[PDB]
């Protein structure tokens, strides 16, 4: 939760998270960062074990029954604005629901969702390319057109669309006047983003990784008490990276779930040892190093090696897979180069650059490289004179 | 498809693949394949270039397929080797201690794709039948492939004296006739290095038989690791109360 | 050059066998006669790969020597590496 | 540096004479690597007559 | 020397150990855009008239 008034604010790109939690192992200076008021993260029970192999490298396996209860389930607000204006002498822009017959440039997106004044009412789902703001500009060429009788199309359509592949429900719409005094409208579309197997989670210790896979509460390894890890991270993360304070937080916070006190992580104490923690952990009936006996989830059998579980504080990151995904087949094309557009929002093509064409001189593939730099991109024909070599 | 990650430093960073279509949103690739591309899974991305004609698609297939590029011209070593949990599990799977009952052999053999249909005879027939990890791993090793490497902990005093071939610690690795006789596997045998048990496969057998070699180690030793599991915990970063005194008296000194 | 005195490897370089199975599969993919008996094959690359092991492909490879000359090897005369 | 090493060598290639020649036909090597063998199939070995 | 291309796609990667070496998971919406032109013959015309 970034600011507490966010329901009033209109900002492009506002993430927010349903269920934040203040940590269970907390530095004593977080009180002056006001991190109990606006916490970003949720505690999670974290096994450190190699389980099915999907959590290898930096990935994370998650519990899918947790993700169904609101865990790391967030909201993404996106905000659009369009400004009516008076530019030419006769040329005015207006908010209005365009008609196919009078308006000129039109697309097959549904315009039935626009109101009488050409603005979606809030609470109306719109997917990519659905029309948020109908805006027509009167075409001054009608004046430029002389004796053209009554031109079929007097009005050109400037209407603004949802960004492609952005689905969501229109949350709020507002209509005001800007500096100049023209009508001005901001519109806030939102969509709830459930953590997928592409999304990106990270602890406080520098351990970042995607989601490998989601097993349901059935399939997760459970303790003797029926506690199943919300999140399982690979043990190989630790040895070369050497974040041990990640191992003590899972330890310090398992005493602080039991005792009911919120532990003290502040960096320099000498009053907190791994040895003074463990003696508090042995009193609640756990192995003092935090290891705990687990049963395999699929086959029921115990897992030979004891697994290290504890509550740990993870953050969900602005980086999600739905916004990084892209695919290109024969789309828009640049004006000057007649090559594919740049960027994901434009349905643009990915760059096949220098280093790549030097790897396929290595492979010795000439016909993949001529197709990749000629046929897939702009093909073209010229007529060349034979005597001079110049074009004809 | 041809499949890329920037920057492409050498030519193993563009390798042709064979599509399999799965749900959700992310490209998915075997973990041995993360060695050439130098890509770990935290927010990475990789391009995909789908070749558009049978004539350029038969170049990828016979030139750039990943099973063809196993061995690099640079250092004349294999590029791809066993990585992460499986290379930890192999070692724990291959010790003398590991004895798999009849129920846990039936599952492992089920993940061998090259398995010839015959359940091998247990190492210990009586009182209770028990297979060994070296006995099941010897069904993975393809063809008749033969190697002698040495384990990392192998002491130097061992090769010289008595117990050369009995190997008290089970360090020396021998593979005779496609059967793992003795020793523990590690980075120096399954990993990428000249002469590793993987590099002898591609050389002696071929690029096709060595594709089924990686996929068997990973599937039968990942589905075994659900029995043992693995972890790091605070109990493993801690020494004796006697060792903490020897570490200080050296510092004060 | 003459059929005598040809100096080139008799083996088929992995670049030639990549462009032979590509060019042959492109012909098969357009109504082209198939030299070998095909059994349950709707895929041209598998058919063209099959013609190769039987040495039935009707292509002669023209190898340019670096000095400007050339040699013509038929796909039967060459020795398939794999 | 990776970009400079490629642009200078990019066109050197093993011709059908097996002589390595750059783009002009000028001879860089009479045989590739002086033994004329692709580098992916070689291994380490001891001579055992030496020493 | 290099240029933006069609028939390309980019997304995150995550492990599937159940695949072979040479396979790759490709999601259905990235595999729905990218198309492969296929020449009709008497062999596949039964399959392609359905597609």
């Amino acid at each position: 939760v970034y600011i507490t008034n966010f329901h009033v604010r209109m900002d492009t790109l506002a993430h927010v998270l349903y269920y934040p939690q203040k940590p269970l192992v907390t530095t004593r200076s977080m009180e002056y960062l006001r991190f109990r008021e606006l916490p970003a993260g949720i505690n999670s029970i974290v096994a450190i074990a190699s389980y099915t192999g999907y959590n290898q490298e930096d990935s994370v396996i998650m519990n899918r029954s947790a993700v169904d209860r609101g865990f790391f389930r967030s909201v993404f607000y996106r905000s659009y604005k369009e400004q009516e204006s008076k530019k030419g002498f006769d040329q005015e822009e207006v908010f209005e629901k365009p008609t196919r017959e009078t308006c000129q440039g039109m697309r097959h997106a549904i315009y039935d969702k626009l109101d009488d004044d050409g603005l979606i009412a809030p609470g109306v789902r719109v997917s990519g390319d659905d029309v948020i703001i109908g805006k027509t500009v009167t075409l001054p060429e009608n004046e430029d057109e002389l004796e053209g009788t009554n031109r079929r199309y007097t009005k050109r359509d400037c209407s603004t669309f949802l960004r492609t592949s952005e689905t969501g429900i229109v949350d709020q719409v507002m209509v005001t006047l800007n500096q100049e005094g023209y009508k001005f409208c901001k519109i806030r579309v939102r969509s709830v983003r459930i953590p997928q197997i592409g999304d990106k989670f990270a602890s406080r210790h520098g351990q970042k990784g995607t989601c490998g896979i989601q097993y349901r509460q059935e399939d997760m390894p459970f303790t003797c008490e029926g506690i199943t890890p919300d999140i399982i991270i690979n043990p190989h993360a630790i040895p070369s990276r050497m974040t041990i304070g990640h191992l003590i937080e899972c330890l310090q916070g398992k005493v602080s779930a039991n005792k009911g006190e919120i532990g003290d992580a502040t960096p320099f104490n000498d009053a907190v040892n791994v040895q003074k923690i463990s003696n508090l952990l042995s009193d609640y009936g756990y192995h003092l190093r935090g290891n705990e006996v687990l049963y395999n989830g699929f086959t029921g059998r115990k897992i030979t090696s004891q697994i290290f579980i504890g509550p740990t504080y993870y953050q969900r990151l602005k980086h999600m897979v739905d916004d990084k995904i892209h695919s290109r087949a024969r789309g828009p094309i640049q004006i000057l180069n007649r090559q594919p557009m740049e960027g994901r929002s434009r349905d643009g093509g990915l760059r096949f650059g220098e280093m790549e064409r030097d790897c396929q001189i290595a492979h010795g593939a000439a016909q993949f490289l001529r197709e990749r730099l000629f046929e897939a991109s702009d093909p073209y024909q010229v007529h060349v004179c034979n005597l001079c070599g110049i074009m004809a | 498809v041809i499949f890329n990650r920037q920057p492409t430093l050498h030519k193993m960073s563009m390798m042709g693949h064979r599509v399999r279509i799965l749900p959700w949103s992310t490209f998915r690739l075997n973990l041995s394949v993360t060695t050439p591309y130098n890509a770990d899974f935290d927010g990475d991305e990789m391009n995909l270039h789908l070749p558009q004609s049978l004539e350029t698609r038969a170049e990828i297939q016979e030139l750039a397929m990943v099973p063809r590029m196993i061995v690099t011209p640079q250092s004349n070593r294999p590029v791809m080797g066993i990585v992460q949990d499986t290379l930890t599990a192999v070692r724990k799977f291959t010790k003398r201690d590991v004895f798999l009952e009849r129920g846990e052999v039936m599952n492992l053999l089920m993940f061998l794709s090259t398995w010839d249909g015959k359940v091998p005879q247990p190492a210990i027939l009586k009182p209770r039948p028990l297979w060994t990890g070296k006995q099941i791993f010897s069904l993975i090793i393809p063809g008749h492939i033969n190697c002698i490497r040495t384990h990392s902990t192998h002491p130097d005093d061992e090769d010289s004296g008595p117990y050369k071939h009995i190997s008290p610690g089970d360090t020396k690795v021998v593979v005779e006739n496609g059967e793992l006789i003795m020793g523990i596997l590690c980075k120096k045998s399954l990993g990428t290095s000249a002469g590793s048990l993987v590099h002898i496969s591609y050389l002696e057998m071929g690029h096709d038989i060595t594709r089924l070699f990686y996929s068997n180690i990973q599937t039968v030793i990942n589905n075994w690791l659900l029995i043992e599991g693995h972890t790091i915990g605070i109990g493993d970063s801690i020494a004796d109360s006697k060792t903490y005194q020897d570490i200080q008296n050296t510092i004060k000194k | 050059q003459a059929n005598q005195k040809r100096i080139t490897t008799p083996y088929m370089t992995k670049y030639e066998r990549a462009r032979v199975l590509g060019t042959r599969a492109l012909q098969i993919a357009m109504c082209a006669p198939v030299m070998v008996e095909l059994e349950g094959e709707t895929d041209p690359l598998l058919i063209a790969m099959k013609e190769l092991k039987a040495r039935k492909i009707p292509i002669i490879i023209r190898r340019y020597l670096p000095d400007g000359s050339y040699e013509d090897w038929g796909v039967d005369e060459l020795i398939i590496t794999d | 540096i990776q970009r400079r090493l490629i642009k200078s060598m990019e066109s050197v290639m093993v011709k059908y004479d097996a002589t390595v020649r750059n783009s002009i036909n000028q001879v860089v090597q009479l045989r590739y690597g002086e033994d004329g063998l692709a580098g992916e199939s070689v291994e380490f070995q001891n001579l055992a007559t030496l020493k | 020397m290099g240029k933006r291309v069609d028939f390309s796609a980019r997304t995150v990667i995550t492990p599937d150990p159940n695949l072979s070496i040479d396979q790759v998971g490709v999601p259905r919406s990235i595999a729905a855009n990218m198309t492969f032109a296929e020449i009709v013959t008497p062999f596949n015309i039964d399959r392609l008239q359905e597609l």
């Binding site: 010795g364 000439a366 | - | 670049y15 008996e37 292509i59 490879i61 190898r63 | 290639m13 | -």
Partner: peptide, 22 residues
């Protein structure tokens, strides 16, 4: 480069043999 070094020609004499359905 590789795959481009040589040139393919169609052998006209060999096409006259083999049982050919299409």
């Amino acid at each position: 480069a590789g795959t481009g070094c040589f040139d393919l020609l169609l052998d006209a004499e060999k096409c006259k043999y083999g049982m050919e359905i299409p």
